[PDB]
Amino acid sequence: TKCTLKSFTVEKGIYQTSNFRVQPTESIVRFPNITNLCPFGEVFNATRF
């Protein structure tokens, strides 16, 4: 509060100082179960362009 009002003494009242936010406890990833690699070999590396 002292830093919000920029004073070393504060007067009786209610002051809004900051914001509360719950924090993420975990990180999850969901991707499809596709498995086969991709045919980049026969696109970049091919005889006849």
Ligand X SMILES: *[C@@H]1O[C@H](CO)[C@@H](O[C@@H]2O[C@H](CO)[C@@H](O)[C@H](O)[C@H]2NC(C)=O)[C@H](O)[C@H]1NC(C)=O
Q: Which stretch binds ligand X (CB under 6 A): 3-11, 14-22, 28-36, 38-46?
A: 38-46
Instruction: Report the residue from 6, 21, 30, 48 that binds another protein according to the rule CB under 8 A.
Output: 48
Count H helices and E strands in the chain, helices first: 2, 0
Query: Residue 45 binds which one of ligand X, another protein, none, with CB within 5 to 8 A depending on kind?
Result: ligand X
Q: In the numeric block, which tokens belong to residue 46?
A: 């091919």
By the rule CB under 8 A, 47 interacts with another protein: yes
DSSP H stretches of helix in 1-49: 2-5, 41-44
- Residue 3's nearest CA partner among 17, 14, 13 is 17
* 20 versus 49: smaller Cβ distance to ligand X: 49
